[PDB]
Amino acid sequence: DVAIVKEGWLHKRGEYIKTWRPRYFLLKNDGTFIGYKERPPLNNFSVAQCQLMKTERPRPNTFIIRCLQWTTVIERTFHVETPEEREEWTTAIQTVADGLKKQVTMNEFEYLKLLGKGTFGKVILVKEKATGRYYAMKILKKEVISRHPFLTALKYSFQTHDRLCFVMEYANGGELFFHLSRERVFSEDRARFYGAEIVSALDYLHSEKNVVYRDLKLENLMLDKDGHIKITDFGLCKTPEYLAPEVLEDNDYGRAVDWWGLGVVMYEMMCGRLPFYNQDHEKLFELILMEEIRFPRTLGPEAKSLLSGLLKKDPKQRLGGGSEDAKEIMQHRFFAGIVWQHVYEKKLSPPFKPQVTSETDTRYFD
Ligand SMILES: *CCC(=O)Nc1ccc2[nH]c(=O)n(C3CCN(Cc4ccc(-c5nc6cc[nH]c(=O)c6cc5-c5ccccc5)cc4)CC3)c2c1
Between CA 259 and CA 201 the distance in angstroms is: 12
Question: What DSSP state is assigned to residue 355?
Answer: S
Look at residue 92 and give its three-state secondary structure. helix
Atom of ligand 1 nearest to the CA of 146: 30
Measuring CA to CA, how many Å separate 138 from each of 65, 113, 216, 236, 271?
21, 13, 19, 9, 34
Q: Does the beta carbon of 178 lie inside 6 Å of ligand 1?
A: no
Residue 192 CA to residue 198 CA, distance in Å, equals 10
My answer on whether 200 and 98 are in the same domain is no
Cα 252 to chain centroid, rounded: 16
Q: Which residues precede gaps in the chain, with C-N > 2.5 A?
A: 40, 103, 145, 238
Please give the angle made by the CA atoms of 221, 226 and 229, to the nearest 5 degrees: 20
Which amino acids are annotated catalytic? 215
Residues 338 and 208 in one domain: yes
Of all protein residues, the one whose alpha carbon is nearest to atom 10 of ligand 1 is 74
Q: Is 217 in the pocket of ligand 1 (CB under 6 A)?
A: no
Q: What is the DSSP letter of 143?
A: G
- The Cα–Cα gap between 92 and 26 comes to 12
Check whether residue 214 and residue 357 sit in a common domain: yes
Q: Both 365 and 218 in a single domain?
A: yes
Residue numbers of the domain that contains 24: 1-102
SS (H, E, C) 193-219: HHHHHHHHHHHHHHHHCCCCCCCCCHH
Q: Note the resolution in Å, 1 decimal.
A: 2.9
- Does residue 220 have a known ligand-binding role? no
Q: Are 56 and 203 part of one and the same domain?
A: no
CA of 154 to the centre of ligand 1 (A): 13
- The set of residues, in sequence order, having a beta carbon less than 8 Å from that of 28 and lying 6+ positions away, is 2, 3, 4, 5
213 lies in the same domain as 347 = yes
Question: How many angstroms separate the CA atoms of 174 and 152, rounded?
Answer: 14
- Torsion-angle region of 353 (φ positive above 0: left; ψ -120 to 50: alpha; else: beta): beta
344 in the same domain as 260: yes
Same domain, 218 and 85: no
Q: Is 235 in the pocket of ligand 1 (CB under 6 A)?
A: yes
Q: Find the CATH number of the domain harbouring 26.
A: 2.30.29.30
Alpha helix (H) residue ranges in the chain:
83-102, 176-183, 188-203, 245-248, 256-271, 281-290, 301-310, 327-330, 340-344
CB burial of 50-79 (b: ≥16 within 10 Å; e: otherwise) equals bbeeeeeeeeebbbbbbbbeebbbebbbbb
User: 116 labelled as ligand-binding?
Assistant: yes
Q: Vertex 139, ends 235 and 171: CA angle to 5°?
A: 55
**Same domain for 97 and 179?**
no
Taking phi over 0 as left and psi of -120 to 50 as alpha, with beta for the rest, 292 belongs to: beta
Looking at the fold, whether 245 and 349 belong to one and the same domain comes out as: yes
Method: X-ray
First to last CA, the chain: 56
Cα(155)–Cα(152) distance, integer angstroms? 9
